[PDB]
Ligand binder design. Structure first.
Ligand SMILES: *[C@@H]1O[C@H](CO)[C@@H](O)[C@H](O)[C@H]1NC(C)=O
Ligand SMILES: *[C@@H]1O[C@H](CO)[C@@H](O)[C@H](O)[C@H]1NC(C)=O
Ligand SMILES: [Ca+2]
Ligand SMILES: [Ca+2]
Ligand SMILES: [Ca+2]
Ligand SMILES: [Ca+2]
Ligand SMILES: [Ca+2]
Lengths: 146, 301, 157
């Protein structure tokens, strides 16, 4: 087990780091798993409006907004990276032309030159998080193994 | 494309005309903006959206001090009688051309983006606002750097007219007016931004507005920050933020925020702050600051 | 233009369409025998026997600009179908489309390259007549199969 450091953490609106959230003082005490904190966050990469879990349009999170990746040079290598980051099987198809509907929010990624072996889509060399003229009709989509 | 930008046009007894830009410094542009009620002039140019008919006559300004309440009060201005041969019209773009604001946010420097198009405020669709546009927005409102852009009407939906303009900000612009914008949504997709100056720190219980006990507001409650880690560098930044110059000495509930200012920060939002796990603090041992009160006074290394 | 590459003949291999100064292959998506009848009749190879795909005839290097083929079969041009667009790749060379036509012709010897002469036409294998079989024809067969320059006629075994 691991001793508990801090408790009663109350993050206000505006800080993006836990260090700026006021709370009870640091104390070294033994804590049972009942009062320990377990958090299951949703990864930045996700697919929406798909028949299965690992199918649908590709959406990423950056700067507090759920953006969408444009289908510029969106080949199977990019889909291989996306499916691997999602944690399911290898990609089956890399759809284009907003196959699974129009995405919401802005567009962060376009012309992603993934090599098919990147651990995450953020390691792919491309113009990232803005400076994109793509519309929502050009939203990329991914179809992975069930 | 707005009432505070474009080529200036002068009408005297119902006559079309403009102003020749001879000696058209920023002072005369500021005077024009002041008489027009559009803030302060920024750039002697504009993004062309409409066309103004050419006119034979011109308005010539010899010299204006800059503090004049109107162009007509400037000394020795000549209307007609000369020709704008080698010069052009006095193009201008005042600030309120794109005057933004943040509303619907509990903390100071966050809220739904609402850019005013001269007179009418309006929301912006989340797809027509990038990181560079948000960064300029936080900079213009002296709110530091941008933390996040929250789409889908995070701060609620603002009634009004949604602008279809898309800001092509480079990122280094000092105002949204200077940004090139490309005109061409729904209120459920209103864009909101969160800047980095969320501190909301003030001085309370002082004989002078530039003096008193340090109080800070987080979690929606004003509290009395104490001097466990309130060094003189922290006090220097607080006085600088409050436009009180520099600090001199440091004599609800108690917030335990630890401010790690280096002294050169212009606001508390820029200062690295650590509040997690901070130890308790004696009630009688609280933070306070006496500022110099001279805005001209500045710190030194 | 139009051509077939790496199929062992003129009427088999990956379908290649030439435009904009380059040769490209089809995505194979919805690549039915009806879509193969038009490509085979364009070359004059008659009807189509197989409509292969998934790089059955190899990995085709070159941009892909033809996907989602819905040819009805009656038409006589590959580009006249319901093409998704001139450049809508959205696919990979590992899913390259290839066809086999009726007039695709192949040869082999069955019994390495000593045995009965078999010719593959119209999707079926069959022997070749021994009448008027000169030494030049046997030499052409052996050179074609790539295992000799000449040959000899043998009785049936
Ligand atoms: C993903 O691909 C498989 C086979 O390639 C297909 O059966 C399935 O329908 C696809 N998923 C879609 C189109 O959502
Ligand atoms: C082609 O189709 C025929 C039946 O029409 C079949 O017997 C043959 O195995 C097929 N060949 C290939 C390579 O698909
Ligand atoms: Ca790619
Ligand atoms: Ca300090
Ligand atoms: Ca396919
Ligand atoms: Ca396809
Ligand atoms: Ca078909």
């Amino acid at each position: 087990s691991i001793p508990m450091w801090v408790d009663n953490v109350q993050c206000p609106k505006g800080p993006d780091t836990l260090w700026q959230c006021p709370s009870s003082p640091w104390e070294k005490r033994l804590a049972s798993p009942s009062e320990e904190t377990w958090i299951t966050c949703d990864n930045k990469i996700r697919l929406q409006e798909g028949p299965t879990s690992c199918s649908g349009r590709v959406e990423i999170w950056h700067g507090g907004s759920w953006g969408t990746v444009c289908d510029d040079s969106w080949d199977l290598d990019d889909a291989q990276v996306v499916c691997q980051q999602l944690g399911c099987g290898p990609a089956l198809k890399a759809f284009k032309e907003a196959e699974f509907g129009q995405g919401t929010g802005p567009i962060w990624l376009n012309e992603v030159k993934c090599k098919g072996n990147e651990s995450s889509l953020w390691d792919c060399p491309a113009r990232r998080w803005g400076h994109s003229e793509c519309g929502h009709k050009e939203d990329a989509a991914v179809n992975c193994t069930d | 494309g707005s009432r505070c930008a474009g080529t200036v046009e002068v009408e005297i007894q119902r006559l079309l005309g403009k102003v020749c830009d001879r000696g058209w410094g920023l002072k005369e542009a500021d005077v024009v903006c002041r008489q027009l009620g559009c803030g302060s002039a920024l750039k002697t140019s504009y993004q062309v959206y409409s066309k103004i008919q050419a006119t034979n006559t011109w308005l010539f300004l010899s010299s204006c001090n800059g503090n004049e309440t109107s162009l007509w009060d400037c000394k020795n201005w000549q209307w007609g009688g000369l020709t704008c041969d080698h010069y052009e019209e006095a193009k201008i773009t005042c600030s309120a051309h794109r005057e933004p604001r943040l509303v619907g946010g509990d903390i100071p420097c966050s809220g739904r983006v609402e850019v005013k198009h001269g007179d009418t405020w309006g929301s912006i669709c989340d797809s027509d606002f990038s990181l560079e546009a948000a960064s300029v927005l936080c900079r213009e409102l002296q709110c530091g750097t941008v933390v996040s852009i929250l789409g889908g009407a995070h701060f609620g939906e603002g009634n009004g007219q949604i602008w279809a303009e898309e800001f092509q900000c480079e990122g280094h612009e000092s105002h949204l007016s200077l940004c090139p914008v490309a005109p061409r949504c729904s209120h459920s997709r209103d864009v909101g931004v969160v800047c980095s100056r969320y501190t909301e720190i003030r001085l309370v219980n002082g004989k002078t507005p530039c003096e008193g006990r340090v109080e800070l507001k987080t979690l929606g409650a004003w509290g009395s920050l104490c001097n466990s880690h309130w060094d003189i560098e922290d006090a220097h930044v607080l006085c600088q933020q409050l436009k009180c110059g520099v600090a001199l000495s440091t004599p609800g509930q108690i917030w335990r925020h630890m401010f790690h200012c280096t002294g050169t920060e212009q606001h508390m939002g820029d200062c690295p702050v650590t509040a997690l796990g901070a130890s308790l603090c004696p009630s009688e041992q609280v933070a306070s600051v006496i500022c110099s009160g001279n805005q001209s006074q500045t710190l030194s290394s | 233009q139009l051509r077939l590459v790496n199929g062992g003949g003129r009427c088999a291999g990956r379908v290649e369409i030439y435009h904009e100064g380059s040769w490209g292959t089809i995505c194979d998506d919805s690549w039915d025998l009806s879509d193969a009848h038009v490509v085979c009749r364009q070359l004059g190879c008659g009807e189509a026997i197989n409509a292969t795909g998934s790089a059955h005839f190899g990995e085709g290097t070159g941009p892909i600009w033809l996907d989602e083929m819905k040819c009805n079969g009656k038409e006589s041009r590959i580009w006249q179908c319901h093409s998704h667009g001139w450049g809508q790749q959205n696919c990979r060379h590992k899913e390259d489309a290839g066809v086999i036509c009726s007039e695709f012709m192949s040869l082999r010897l069955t019994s390495a390259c000593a045995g009965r002469l078999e010719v593959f036409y119209n999707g079926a294998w069959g022997t070749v007549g021994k009448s008027s079989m000169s030494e030049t024809t046997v030499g052409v067969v052996c050179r074609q199969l790539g295992c000799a320059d000449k040959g000899k006629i043998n009785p049936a075994s």
